[PDB]
Amino acid sequence: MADEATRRVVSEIPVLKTNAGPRDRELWVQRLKEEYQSLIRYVENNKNADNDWFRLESNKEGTRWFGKCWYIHDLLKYEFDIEFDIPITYPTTAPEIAVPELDGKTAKMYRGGKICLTDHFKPLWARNVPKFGLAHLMALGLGPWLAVEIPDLIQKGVIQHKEKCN
Ligand SMILES: [Mg+2]
C-alpha cells in the first residue's frame, strides 16, 4: 500500500536529477533550478486542486528557506510560519522542517520546533535519493504531519484561526 500511496501523492511532481548539496557550486545552482521548477509545478497542481496550502522562498544561496503553510478545519483557516536549513549532505539527508510557534504544544516535535515525522519517512526518502526534493518534503512530510497534529491542537484549544471560511 505504501508504494501506491507514494505514487498517488507524487506522480505530478517533477522528479529531481542532480545529486548535489549547498557546497557543490555549479551543480548546486543546477539542483536549485530543479527544486524551483518542482516547487512551482507542485503549487500550480495545488491551486487546481483547491489546496494551495503553502508558500516558500529562500535566500540568494538557496540554503535557508522560510515561508508559511495554511490548514483548513471545520471552516476555519490556520496559518503557521515555517523554516528550514539545507543540510550539507542534501539531497541524501532530508531537511528538518520547523514550525517554531508550535514548540511545546505537541509531542511530535523536537525541542526547537522541528517537526517529528513517523519512522516511515526517512526510509522512503532514502530509497528515492536524489529524486525527491523540497516539493516532496512538503507533500510527503509536512502535509501529513499537519493532517494529524493540527486537528489535535485544535481539539486541545491551544491554537487559534487566522480567518474563517464561508
Ligand atoms: Mg502566525
UniProtKB/Swiss-Prot annotation:
The keyword Ubl conjugation applies. The active site is at C116 (glycyl thioester intermediate). Changing Q30A: Does not affect neither UBA5-binding nor thioester formation with UFM1. Ufmylated at Lys-122. Deufmylated by UFSP1. Gene3D superfamilies: Ubiquitin Conjugating Enzyme. Keywords: Disease variant, Isopeptide bond, Ubl conjugation, Ubl conjugation pathway. There is a cross-link at K122 (Glycyl lysine isopeptide (Lys-Gly) (interchain with G-Cter in UFM1)). GO terms for molecular function: UFM1 conjugating enzyme activity; UFM1 transferase activity. Pfam families: UFC1 (PF08694). GO terms for biological process: brain development; protein K69-linked ufmylation; protein ufmylation; regulation of type II interferon production; response to endoplasmic reticulum stress; reticulophagy. One of its GO terms (cellular component) is extracellular exosome. Changing D50A: Decreased ribosome ufmylation. It is linked to Neurodevelopmental disorder with spasticity and poor growth: An autosomal recessive disorder apparent soon after birth or in early infancy. NEDSG is characterized by axial hypotonia, delayed psychomotor development, poor feeding, failure to thrive, peripheral spasticity with hyperreflexia, poor overall growth, and microcephaly in most patients. Additional variable features include contractures, facial dysmorphisms, and ocular movement abnormalities. In absence of UBA5, the active site is solvated by water molecules thereby reducing its nucleophilic activity. A linker region of UBA5 is required to reduce the amount of water molecules in the vicinity of the active site and elevate its nucleophilic activity. E2-like enzyme which specifically catalyzes the second step in ufmylation. Accepts the ubiquitin-like modifier UFM1 from the E1 enzyme UBA5 and forms an intermediate with UFM1 via a thioester linkage. Ufmylation is involved in various processes, such as ribosome recycling, response to DNA damage, interferon response or reticulophagy (also called ER-phagy). Interacts with UBA5 (via C-terminus). Interacts with UFL1. Interacts with UFM1. Interacts with KIRREL3. Belongs to the ubiquitin-conjugating enzyme family. UFC1 subfamily. This is Ubiquitin-fold modifier-conjugating enzyme 1. It comes from Homo sapiens (Human). The lineage of its organism: Eukaryota, Metazoa, Chordata, Craniata, Vertebrata.
